């Protein structure tokens, strides 16, 4: 930028006389060295390490941009379990200030049951839970909230049974067109926490598979602090 | 006088017993100047001959 | 005893003056300020602490 | 390429900022092909350079 | 320590121990820097003031 | 708008979290030379994908200010146009000089993005949430929309600055350094009794 003018190559410099060799490094950098490692070889090696890693960055960006995420929404389990761990984390924080926070369910775990026959997936958590008013406000009107709502990408209808410390257990059900909240017939079966029964779509039958759900848990939720149980 | 600089002139040195230190404070450390090393008056002759 | 010189006089200026061939005389005392010690340092004569 | 890069070696210089105690820049060509430096003289005050 | 022939003078500072008895030691190998490794006869003086 | 489109707003913002997370990741890299190389791949891959996405929407003939893109073929194109353009705004703001060199030169790229920007501005996607300003900011940055008096790209700094002709702070650095050098010299002389000139 500072100046312009790029030199050309002197295709026939060699003939010049009484001039010093301006290529010692290049030639010597490839001479076979018995009982020693050739200079050029070591250079190539590190180059492979650094250069290869750099290519990986392109790989990552390529996927993110060139993908369709929601079309290939296998992450929906990540979103669902991630919320379950988050809710267990939230209730754990509340428990320290208030003993009653964990009264409904002291144990913090996630239980997963797969019902292929009924096209239903049941995810049960013992997290903070949700009140009837919160079910209408938070869930009845959406909004990130993607963690719970990713389920609809593979599910036509979502059924949520939520019990919070401040309120009795209530069930919020929506098909994405309308939502209804009613008092839970079973009562405080959870004590506290949320169990989501997912009405999966026809395309989501593979997710119902016991192996598939376990693979998704390893793929995305392996690092969850709380133990994860899969029905077997 | 700095030993490294040749041009320094030791015009008048102190006595063999003389030294430079804080009178009130005891001499725990080695004196800055001791014996004849101490200089009372010194001169410099620059390369350009400035004095 | 003067800590600082008035106007444009500075240790650099005095050093330039000596390089020009001017003759300088310096008289010190127990109240020596920093500039006099610095000037000696440039000339290779090390004054003691105040 | 970032500043201070050397085009012919295709590498960036490790040491970018330094000063010449005993040499001074006399003339440099427009494209920097030839650089001339002048030898500094001894110290007037005799200080070690 | 005053070198008789050269006239050089070397001054050392003596310090008391816990018992208030002053102790001084001369080690030639270590003290080479102080004397510049200049061998010879030195008159020894005690200065108290 | 359409209820599913409202769901898309959550979907788009969700992608933004990954896009910003990567955007920080790219910042972690130090070498500019690598940085331009990947960034150029960002533009060529994104814009070429955008060109197909606009063609997909053009065949669909679905109004931007309209019902949620439903058919998967157009709907993914809608995800690409809005999501990629939003990331394009982040890339432009974070890296103004790099994009302008590799983007302004090509008329096709500017026209294609311009169709996308209006296409987003009619959908209303950049009207709510914390990413709504992004549409306004990017248009101003690219000159598609008038720049606000207070609109300044934080990243668009002149790293070249100006030759540090004024270096009194560095002059003080020189003094202190040489002063420490001078202090050691005196300390050396101390030691014990030396010889006498």
Report the residue of chain F nearest D11, measured CA to CA.
F33
DSSP state of C47: P
Within chain A, where are the H helices?
24-28, 39-66, 76-97, 132-134, 146-149, 151-154, 205-208, 210-220
Mind giving me the DSSP string for B16-45? TT-EE--SSS---SPPSEEGGG-EEEEEE-
Q: What's the rounded Cα separation, in Å, for the pair A84 and A155?
A: 18
- With contact defined as beta carbons under 8 Å apart, do F86 and F12 qualify? yes
Phi, psi of A179 (to 5 degrees): -130, 140
D1, D29, D31, D33: best mutation site toward chain A, by most A Cβ within 10 Å? D31
Any B CB within 8 A of E13 CB: yes
* Tokens (6 digits) for C31: 């109240």
Resolution of the model in angstroms: 4.1
Any D CB within 8 A of A3 CB: yes
Report the residue of chain E nearest B19, measured CA to CA.
E11
Beta-carbon count within 10 A of B34 CB: 24
Residue numbering of the annotated binding site of A for ATP: 83, 125, 138, 148
Phi, psi of A195 (to 5 degrees): -115, 120
- With contact defined as beta carbons under 8 Å apart, do A144 and A151 qualify? no
Say how many CB pairs under 8 Å bridge A and D. 3
User: Collapsing DSSP states into helix, strand and coil, what is residue F67?
Assistant: coil
Of F17, F41, F76, the CB nearest to A58: F41
- The secondary element (H helix, E strand) that includes residue F34 is helix F32-60
Any C CB within 8 A of B11 CB: no
- The secondary element (H helix, E strand) that includes residue B8 is strand B8-13
Contact (CB<8Å) C15/D46: no
DSSP state of F163: -
Q: What's the rounded Cα separation, in Å, for the pair A170 and C43?
A: 92
Cα distances (Å, whole numbers) of residue D17 to A164, D14, D36, D40 = 65, 9, 19, 20
Residue numbering of the annotated binding site of A: 83, 125, 138, 148
- With contact defined as beta carbons under 8 Å apart, do A226 and A109 qualify? yes
Phi, psi of F164 (to 5 degrees): -70, 55
Distance of CA A133 to the CA centre of its chain: 30
Contact (CB<8Å) B51/C19: no
């Amino acid at each position: 930028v500072d100046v312009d003018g790029t030199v050309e190559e002197d295709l026939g410099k060699s003939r010049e006389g009484s001039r010093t060799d301006d290529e010692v490094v290049q030639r010597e950098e490839e001479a076979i060295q018995l009982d020693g490692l050739n200079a050029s070889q070591i250079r190539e090696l590190r180059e492979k390490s650094e250069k290869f890693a750099f290519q990986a960055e392109v790989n990552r960006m390529m996927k993110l941009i060139i993908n369709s995420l929601y079309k290939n929404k296998e992450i929906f389990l990540r979103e669902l379990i991630s919320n379950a761990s988050d809710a267990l984390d939230k209730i754990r924080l509340i428990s320290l200030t208030d003993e009653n926070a964990l009264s409904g369910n002291e144990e913090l775990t996630v239980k997963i049951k797969c019902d292929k026959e009924k096209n239903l997936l049941h995810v049960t958590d013992t997290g903070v839970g949700m009140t009837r008013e919160e079910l209408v406000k938070n869930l009845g009107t959406i909004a990130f909230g993607v963690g719970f709502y990713s389920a609809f990408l593979v599910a036509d209808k979502v059924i949520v049974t939520s019990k919070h410390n401040n309120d009795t257990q209530h069930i919020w059900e929506s098909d994405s067109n309308e939502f209804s909240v009613i008092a839970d017939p079973r009562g405080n079966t959870l004590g506290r926490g949320t169990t989501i029964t997912l009405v999966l779509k026809e395309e989501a039958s593979d997710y119902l598979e016991l192996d598939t759900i376990k693979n998704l848990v390893k793929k995305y939720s392996q690092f969850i602090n709380f133990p994860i149980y899969v029905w077997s | 006088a700095d030993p490294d600089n040749p041009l320094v002139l030791d015009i008048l040195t102190g006595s063999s017993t003389s030294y430079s230190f804080f009178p009130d404070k005891p001499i725990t450390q080695y004196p800055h100047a001791v014996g004849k090393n101490t200089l009372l008056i010194a001169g410099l002759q620059a390369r350009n001959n400035a004095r | 005893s003067v800590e600082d010189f008035g106007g444009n006089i500075n240790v650099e200026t005095i050093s330039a003056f000596i390089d020009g061939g001017g003759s300088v005389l310096v008289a010190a005392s127990s109240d020596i300020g920093d500039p006099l010690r610095e000037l000696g340092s440039e000339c290779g004569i090390e004054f003691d602490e105040e | 390429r970032p500043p201070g890069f050397d085009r012919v070696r295709n590498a960036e210089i490790g040491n970018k900022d330094f000063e010449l105690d005993v040499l001074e820049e006399a003339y440099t060509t427009e494209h920097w092909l030839v650089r001339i430096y002048k030898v500094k003289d001894l110290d007037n005050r005799g200080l070690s350079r | 320590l005053h070198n008789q022939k050269t006239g050089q003078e070397v001054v050392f500072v003596a310090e008391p121990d816990n018992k208030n008895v002053y102790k001084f030691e001369l080690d030639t190998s270590e003290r080479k820097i102080e004397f510049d490794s200049a061998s010879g006869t030195y008159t020894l003086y005690l200065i108290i003031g | 708008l359409d209820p599913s489109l409202e769901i898309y707003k959550k979907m788009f913002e969700v992608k933004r979290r990954e896009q910003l997370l990567a955007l920080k990741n790219l910042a972690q890299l130090n070498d500019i030379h690598q940085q331009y190389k990947i960034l150029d791949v960002m533009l060529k891959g994104l814009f070429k994908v955008l060109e197909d996405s606009r063609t997909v929407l053009t065949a669909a003939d679905v109004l931007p200010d309209g019902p949620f893109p439903q058919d998967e073929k157009l709907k993914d194109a809608f995800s690409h146009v809005v999501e990629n353009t939003a990331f394009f705004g982040d890339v432009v703001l974070r890296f103004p000089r790099i994009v302008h060199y590799y983007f302004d030169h090509n008329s096709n790229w500017n026209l294609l993005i311009r169709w996308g920007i209006s296409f987003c501005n009619q959908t209303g996607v950049f009207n709510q949430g914390p990413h709504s300003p992004i549409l306004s900011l990017m248009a101003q940055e690219l000159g598609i929309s008038e720049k606000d008096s207070n609109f300044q790209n934080p990243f668009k700094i002149d790293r070249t600055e100006f030759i540090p002709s004024t270096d009194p702070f560095q002059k003080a650095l020189r003094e202190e350094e040489k002063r420490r050098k001078k202090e050691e010299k005196r300390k050396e002389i101390r030691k014990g009794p030396r010889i006498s000139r």
